[PDB]
Design a protein around this ligand. Sequence first.
Ligand SMILES: CC1(C)Cc2c(C#N)c(SCCc3ccccc3)nc(N3CCOCC3)c2CO1
Lengths: 156, 577, 578, 580
Amino acid sequence: GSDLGKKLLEAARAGRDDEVRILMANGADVNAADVVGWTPLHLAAYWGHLEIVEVLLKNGADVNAYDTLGSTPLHLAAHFGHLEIVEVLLKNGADVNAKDDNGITPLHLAANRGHLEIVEVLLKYGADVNAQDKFGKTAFDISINNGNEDLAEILQ
Amino acid sequence: APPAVTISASYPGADAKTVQDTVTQVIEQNMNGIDNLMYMSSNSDSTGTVQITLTFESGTDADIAQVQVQNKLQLAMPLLPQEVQQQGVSVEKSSSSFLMVVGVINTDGTMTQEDISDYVAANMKDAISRTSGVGDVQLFGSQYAMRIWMNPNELNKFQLTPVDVITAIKAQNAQVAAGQLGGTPPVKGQQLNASIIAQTRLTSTEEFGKILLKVNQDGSRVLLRDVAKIELGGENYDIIAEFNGQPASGLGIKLATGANALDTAAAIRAELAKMEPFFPSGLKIVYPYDTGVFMTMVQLPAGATQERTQKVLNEVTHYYLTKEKNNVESVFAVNGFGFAGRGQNTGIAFVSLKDWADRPGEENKVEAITMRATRAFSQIKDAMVFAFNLTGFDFELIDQAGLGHEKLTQARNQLLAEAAKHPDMLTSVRPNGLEDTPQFKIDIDQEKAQALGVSINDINTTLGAAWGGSYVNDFIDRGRVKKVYVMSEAKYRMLPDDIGDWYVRAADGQMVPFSAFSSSRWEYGSPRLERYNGLPSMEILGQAAPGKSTGEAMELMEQLASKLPTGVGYDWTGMSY
Amino acid sequence: APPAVTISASYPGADAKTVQDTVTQVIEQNMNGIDNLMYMSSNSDSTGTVQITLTFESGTDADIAQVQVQNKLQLAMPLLPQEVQQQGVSVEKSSSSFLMVVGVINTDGTMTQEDISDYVAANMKDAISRTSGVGDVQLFGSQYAMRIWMNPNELNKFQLTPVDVITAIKAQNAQVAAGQLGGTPPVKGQQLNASIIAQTRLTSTEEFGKILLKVNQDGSRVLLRDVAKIELGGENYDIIAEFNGQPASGLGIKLATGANALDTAAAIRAELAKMEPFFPSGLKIVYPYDTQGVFMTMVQLPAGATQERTQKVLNEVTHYYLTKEKNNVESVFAVNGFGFAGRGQNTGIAFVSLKDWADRPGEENKVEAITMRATRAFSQIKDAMVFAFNLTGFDFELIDQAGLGHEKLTQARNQLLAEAAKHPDMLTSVRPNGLEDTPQFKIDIDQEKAQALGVSINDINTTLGAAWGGSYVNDFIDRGRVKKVYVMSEAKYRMLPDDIGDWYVRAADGQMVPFSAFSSSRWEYGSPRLERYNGLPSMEILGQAAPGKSTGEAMELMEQLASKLPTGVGYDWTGMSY
Amino acid sequence: APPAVTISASYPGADAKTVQDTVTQVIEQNMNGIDNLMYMSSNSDSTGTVQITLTFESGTDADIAQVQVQNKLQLAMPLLPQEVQQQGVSVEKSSSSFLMVVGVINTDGTMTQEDISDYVAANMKDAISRTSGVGDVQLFGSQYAMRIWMNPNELNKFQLTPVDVITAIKAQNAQVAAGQLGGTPPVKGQQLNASIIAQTRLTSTEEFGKILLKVNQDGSRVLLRDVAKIELGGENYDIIAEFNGQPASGLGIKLATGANALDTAAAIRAELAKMEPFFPSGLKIVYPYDTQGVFMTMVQLPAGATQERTQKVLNEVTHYYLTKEKNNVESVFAVNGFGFAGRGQNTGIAFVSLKDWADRPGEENKVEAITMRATRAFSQIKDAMVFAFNLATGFDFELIDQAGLGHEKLTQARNQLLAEAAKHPDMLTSVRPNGLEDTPQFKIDIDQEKAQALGVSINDINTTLGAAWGGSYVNDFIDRGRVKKVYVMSEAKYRMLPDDIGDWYVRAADGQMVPFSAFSSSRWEYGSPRLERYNGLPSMEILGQAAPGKSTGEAMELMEQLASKLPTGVGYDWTGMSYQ
Ligand SMILES: CC1(C)Cc2c(C#N)c(SCCc3ccccc3)nc(N3CCOCC3)c2CO1
């Protein structure tokens, strides 16, 4: 596709908000994907760069882009405790029950790292509380296994 | 220059964090009671390599330093993983540079670099090691290993795994004491005395191919060649070397302390002349460096492969061999090697010039050549490629409070972003190391493995042995002891989907695929972890702006450094100590 | 002084005889071919520890001696138990006395004695140990390990044993080399190269707690936290320290043979000044013993004395310096469990620091008079040798020359001591330097009964040892630092003889078998500290010339007395008497 | 003479090739990057022994040479077989020849050769070995081990194997770390603190004999003494010494490189003086070789020769000095199974001590005249190189395999060079190999397909074979307070003839006893009982003399012309006297 594709992946990767605007403006493919299938929105979501997430979404970035293992930007934001990104992704239409190749959902991941504020927002937006991964496990099983009583309360 | 000792260890198939936390930390923690130590630095990388460099006070006797470091390392050896102990952990004086680099090439296209490396190992290196005034000699490549390249589909067909393969090779490529008939103490009057000779080490691909893995219930035999391809090959494949586009190996030769350079160089050249009658066809000796060699760095992006780097190095070689045909004798292209990082995405070209007197005029001097090379290489896409001939400062950012790699990177980026705000005082303030890159995280599900009766050892040996390789034991090749390695044939260990082609046998004999008890995902992590005086570190280089002193640049770095998050410290090293 | 090289090694849960016979004898037998060795001595202790002291002729290059020693030891390492090898054997070339002590307290009481000791172990000790001139560093405390405190009732409920716990920890707290995607040699056209990351070391009690021991036949899960309490705690619990009565830890530092005291102390201070800014709040360095304005006090209780009775005596010592001598004494740093020469529940040391000389005017407020008064004040403490000393009669070794054994050598020692007590005009205070035998719990495993039940001896001995002695399983990463993991019974299931009967082992047929079905036990005596001298069993005797009598006359009488000892008992002079 | 560091290792029951290929080569490959090294040589023997000699430039600091050798050795140590590591690999910096021999005898004849050798190993050797200036100490004999001599009929009668014996010994001769009652951290208030003492090492044959191998279904017990004889005995039985025909042991002592001979000898005597008052009755030190006054006699039979045939030649030598030279000779200390090239069944040595200078008047009664007559009298002993001498025109030649030709081709080549040197008596005298010839060996092939089919494991097959016919060091025990080894091996009468292979049974997975003959075949073949290597390549040392009046220079030069015509791949180098 584009040389600016790769520059945008790199700039989103490294949190360079200004370099990201300038590249958006010059036609850089907003859904350019690297070798593992990560888009700028994936990278910005994983590394916690909120402004870049926002700029990209406004420029039409595919909110539900999936990587080669089926994981979406919301999987990454939920897993790495980035609350304000989780909220924006879900507001711009992120699929709250997206499953990866393993059947893992953003809820499973937030639950596993005990990100409680994130777990609440996911349930706010309709996250399926009884979704099973390929092993039969729910967010509730994950709370029991990790002995995280606060998270057990929240999932009843 | 202050004397330095380097400890080198290798853990095949290990990632940077595995190496650090099972080797590097353990060794660092045992570097006490050593005299005259100024500082210690280490790096641990994704090629399974650790290097710990100890730097001693100027005037320290380097041999005493070496021996003290050695003894402490050797006492710590039982604390290290078996796989690392079996590779040898070397402790060498690292301060000195090469007397000469000797290239060994094949010109008539009959021999791979592994063939050549083996020839050198077996016929050349030892006679060079014993030559007058020679010290350390490094081989560039290895002697052959017997390579067993496994096929998962054939293994699953016959309900076998890599574990069965490794067990069978230990059992059938063996050599043990069997005693004697009529040995002492004997029945008195015994006339017959003879050694008993039982199994002996295997000597060839044919013999390995006949290893019996299993007799089926129908009475058919499964032999090792039915689940694997079998060849003599390299111990490892991280480096590809060419000399003017031809396959190469070589020797890196060091001068013994208090020996003469010119007499040693002539004594080596003489010794190498004696061997020339015995070469096979087209083997040839070349001398890329001997007491105007410059270098060209090649750096591809995160995740880039050996083949992509090779393509770029090939463009670099072709350029010097055509656009500088009047100036350039040779290009020695080393794919997988850099200073500041090994890996599939780096390489370095050693360019050797023709004589001063055959390059008249300033256009044909090194400085003009290098600037032209750099201008030409600037229009290669998706590679940074820099020609250079071999002031600054050397800073270490230090994790002082158990912050972890991720928080240390964020502090590093806080300092680098601040140093950029003062271009009046500082320029080119940059990491010396590497950035985190995508990695494939596989979780084994312990409950599923238990339910199914799949053992975790079987799981982890199957994954490790197939995808990383395993040094099983030794064999004898044309009378010389050499290693035996099991690994997946390349096309079954390339991509995530290949993980599910590998099967493990449960306790009830059913074959279970990897996907039944595992899940995976992409994440970032480090391909090269750095430590300084036993603590996690990130080295940062830089220089004073124009018309400012190094001392002034340092003062600002310290001041910027005082504003970093809690638990982040620093120290000055190297040129800046 | 004759240079001394010291080898130290450890075997967790081993008694003196075990240490002596699997470690000490083996190292000793292999100290051949070393130049200028004058003599060799060793202790094998019921703390699971051995110290071998090799003393070289005067003028020997200590560098060379250390190296020659380390090289012989390296060649013997494969003959030692895996449990000892894996602790790390150390070899040192240093003074036996302390150059200085670095104390560490928490001024805001935010951190316990145990937290502080770990902070010191984990953040300060190694850089101090790498400082040039630093010969030996003793932590006055222990680094944390991950402690798995097993409950035998809960293990038996789920038909598990410590063997199953250990197996599961090694399998689930693992660091796995998994290779790469697109690894070399690659296929043609490969675009992706990435490390594969599988299992990594666990980092938290949470993680160890969810180690999955087993899935019951009804599908429920038995996690490690269901049979154990999981906490960070010391690799050992033997050494506790206080600074002016407050919780403390610290580093006792000994000068490397031939090093410069003053430069080494300065380098140590320079290194501590690099660490101070990153301390957690409250943490503070104090300087309780800088070597004339300082002295020590030794506390030796008889073997068999416990941590609490040693503590009681240390409290009396500390109290005296902080009440009676408060106009002269600035501080006391007291260590329970360490005693200058040796390490044990029955021993302690106090490091005393005086106020400025200028503010202690008068002969009666100088070191000599103070130590002398303190020795007098402590001379009437019951069943404790307590003495204050700044830092010569005779030093005698009774030697087992003919395989006589411990018991006979003790009788022979006692005969010589009794004979020497009957010459009070010639000899004074002729005494053992070592320890008396004490009660020990002898347990006999019935091999016939184990085999009849299908119980494996290795499971029995691993069960006994791991529970009652502790077992170092493998390593984990605590806040980025490699540290150890230990399994052991929780305290309350390993206190009394009846507790033996509550440990169960699983037979080949799946039945749980109590230890009482295949064992029997009795009380007996044995040694908490076995000594050797030049490779043979030995007993060190100290003493002096009586008043008005020469050392050489006293020695001559000791030789006379020694010549009438039972057959096979020899002797030799060492130390000051060589 | 140039300084030499020596690496020595042992692999019990190993043949020469096995030693070479699992031990010697692995070490050798690391011996480079060592300062002032001139050359390296090695022997790998069918006694299961390897010795590598690294020879340094004159004036090299021996302390540093030893250090640097050992640091390269450490790279090979974890690649070595565990049976080698466990024997204790040694690295020494000694002179190659003896400074003195300390003899030990029992004037009351109440102790055998075996008893005496054990007493010396257990109470005397270590302290000598620790003495400064002592480079190497050789025991003429062997320390006692606990010997379990297995009987294969009795083992098969109870469905047991050596694997079971070895397993039981490891389980029941054990030293257990069992912790404490009331240890730390305690329940606060705990008063009781006591060490737990569980199993401890066995100390006696009686305790070994009652080891419980199994309980039958009927409840009867199979004890280790029901399948083996149990006694104290040598770790090995290869070295046997006599002093004036009387049972003896001793220490052969070599001087550490650069150490003072007088000083060192004196400290050895001082240390012996500490031991003497505690000797059992009858025991006494004798001094059969102080370094004219003395000389040695070397005895070398051809490979294949047993202890019996070597003893015979030694008796003829000893008989000579006690009958014919009885007015000159005070004492003969004769050692069967150890000679100049170290250990082997076909070698021996006599140390001869003469009476006082002044009780031997006349030039024919001096060392030179005596050794000449002895060498003369011994020259007609057949199948024996016997000579007497007291400690030059010669050359030291190394034939080297430089192309992977293998041992058989290198022999062929050697024979070709030796035959052509025989046709030049004008220039070359006594051109001979320094080494040993190939001898018959019993080659046994495990059939993997049969083993797998019957369900017998290969480790079980190999242990059974190795332990029975070679012996196996199981673990340690305590003999009269001293750590010592425990060995299992077949009783002699079950490991003497080829048919004995078939009386050893291995137990399959299904419980069936399977004789060795069901999964094995065998044949005679030839191989080497001493493989030599020079600078890391297979080699064959050839010795010889400049013919009368001709220079070493001219004889060396001829040997080069002869060598130049040898097959492709075969090279040479000069070592020792010929190096410079
Ligand atoms: C003096 C200089 C700068 C010159 C110099 C040259 C040249 N010319 C080469 S040539 C490439 C040889 C080779 C062949 C196969 C595999 C790896 C390397 N290689 C060097 N290396 C040093 C570290 O190990 C290998 C690379 C150096 C470093 O010192």
